[PDB]
Amino acid sequence: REIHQDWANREYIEIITSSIKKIADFLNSFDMSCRSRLATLNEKLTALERRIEYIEARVT
Amino acid sequence: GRFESEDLTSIVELDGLLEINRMTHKLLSRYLTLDGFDAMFREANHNVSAPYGRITLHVFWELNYDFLPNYCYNGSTN
């Protein structure tokens, strides 16, 4: 009866929504990790730029 | 600068303070990426762009103006 099909459809929608929220959570986590390692790379680059400034000032 | 406003006998207090600063740099380096202590020290001593630094310049100034004309040597105690 229509109620049975209704239960089936609601279960379908529930599965799809769960998948969508999994995708969103992955997006958030990936963004956080990328921020962290970008900060690290930037710091490393900054440490290197200052060092080359100092060296080339010492050699001239 | 605190060395530069004192006699020659304060070189010991100077290197003591420099060692304290080096230990501080070593401790803070565990978490932060700072310039090497040598680079910082040379920048502070004006010894990057020039041959001699402030410490040696003040050592010579002190020699000339206060050490040669004011001190008495003792051979036995050295």
UniProtKB/Swiss-Prot annotation, chain A:
It is found in: Cytoplasm, Cytoskeleton. It comes from the Eukaryota. One of its GO terms (biological process) is positive regulation of lamellipodium assembly. Residues 32-60 form a coiled coil. GO terms for molecular function: identical protein binding; protein-containing complex binding. GO terms for cellular component: cytoskeleton; cytosol; extracellular exosome; lamellipodium; SCAR complex. Keywords: Acetylation, Coiled coil, Cytoplasm, Cytoskeleton. Belongs to the BRK1 family. Homotrimer when in free form. Directly interacts with WASF2. Component of the WAVE1 complex composed of ABI2, CYFIP1 or CYFIP2, BRK1, NCKAP1 and WASF1/WAVE1. Within the complex, a heterodimer containing NCKAP1 and CYFIP1 interacts with a heterotrimer formed by WAVE1, ABI2 and BRK1. Involved in regulation of actin and microtubule organization. Part of a WAVE complex that activates the Arp2/3 complex. As component of the WAVE1 complex, required for BDNF-NTRK2 endocytic trafficking and signaling from early endosomes. This is Protein BRICK1. It comes from Homo sapiens (Human). The chain holds residues 10 to 69 of 75 of the full protein.
From Swiss-Prot, chain B:
It is found in: Cytoplasm; Cytoplasm, Perinuclear region; Cell projection, Lamellipodium; Cell projection, Ruffle. It comes from the Eukaryota. Breakpoint hotspot for the Prader-Willi/Angelman syndromes and may be implicated in autism. Commonly altered in tumors. Belongs to the CYFIP family. Component of the WAVE1 complex composed of ABI2, CYFIP1 or CYFIP2, BRK1, NCKAP1 and WASF1/WAVE1. Within the complex, a heterodimer containing NCKAP1 and CYFIP1 interacts with a heterotrimer formed by WAVE1, ABI2 and BRK1. Component of the CYFIP1-EIF4E-FMR1 complex which is composed of CYFIP, EIF4E and FMR1. Interacts with FMR1 but does not bind to related proteins FXR1 or FXR2. Interaction with EIF4E stimulates FMR1 binding. Component of the WAVE2 complex composed of ABI1, CYFIP1/SRA1, NCKAP1/NAP1 (NCKAP1l/HEM1 in hematopoietic cells) and WASF2/WAVE2. Component of the CYFIP1-EIF4E-FMR1 complex which binds to the mRNA cap and mediates translational repression. In the CYFIP1-EIF4E-FMR1 complex this subunit is an adapter between EIF4E and FMR1. Promotes the translation repression activity of FMR1 in brain probably by mediating its association with EIF4E and mRNA. Regulates formation of membrane ruffles and lamellipodia. Plays a role in axon outgrowth. Binds to F-actin but not to RNA. Part of the WAVE complex that regulates actin filament reorganization via its interaction with the Arp2/3 complex. This is Cytoplasmic FMR1-interacting protein 1. It comes from Homo sapiens. The chain holds residues 785 to 862 of 1253 of the full protein.
